[PDB]
Ligand binder design. Structure first.
Ligand SMILES: [Zn+2]
Ligand SMILES: [Zn+2]
Lengths: 29, 21, 29, 21, 29, 29, 21, 21, 29, 29, 21, 21
């Protein structure tokens, strides 16, 4: 796939596309 | 971590799989 | 704040708006 | 859970705070 | 809630989450 | 320009694309 | 109103201009 | 106003409530 | 309509609003 | 990668995430 | 086509790659 | 092309019509 440059809400949308209703964790450090 | 990486550098969709429940 | 139906991508976008740098967990069903 | 509370039922940004770290 | 840094379309999405089908006004100066 | 069903968040995103710095009013029902 | 015109019916970006300031 | 504030500074969701119909 | 400043995913959302289910081509050079 | 229903705007956003600078074609029905 | 494969049926990001240039 | 124009300059919705199928 292309590599990603994802900031802010755009990374949460990408995690929804990768994980969907499996669920995921959004975990800034 | 991944949140910072993807915004200041680049990250891959294969890395985001690690954050699925 | 209105109560509304928030689903799928729009629900995790809402979690990003309310939690931000705190992070969140999206663990449906 | 969160789908029943906010998707099939309705919720506001206050109930969302329940799923913040 | 976290404070917000919202530019462009991201603030209209946040106003939809706060107001929903109550409606809202998007009013740049 | 295609005619399509635009609802909820997607309808106010469309209002942002067409009105931008003019602003808009979203006053449903 | 705007929901009947664009959500339940269909509209294009021209009818949207009606709700610009 | 709020549109400028939230983009050049920070704003709160309690401020956006003021723009509801 | 207002002129547009659209980067990344925001231009794909604008092409969906202009073209919809007609379809479109997203063609970076 | 989860399999999910991707439709309309969300489907072309997904095409943008997977194809990016490669471009894509969205030619439904 | 892509609607039957990914919207009415389900698909993952791998089938999406089929519609990349 | 249009992808670059709209991001480094400005573009119009009338230009994007050219990219419809
Ligand atoms: Zn949607
Ligand atoms: Zn953005």
């Amino acid at each position: 796939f292309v590599k990603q440059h994802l900031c802010g809400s755009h990374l949460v949308e990408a995690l929804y596309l990768v994980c969907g209703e499996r669920g995921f964790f959004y975990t800034p450090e | 971590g991944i949140v910072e990486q993807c915004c200041t550098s680049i990250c891959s969709l294969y890395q985001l799989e690690n954050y699925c429940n």
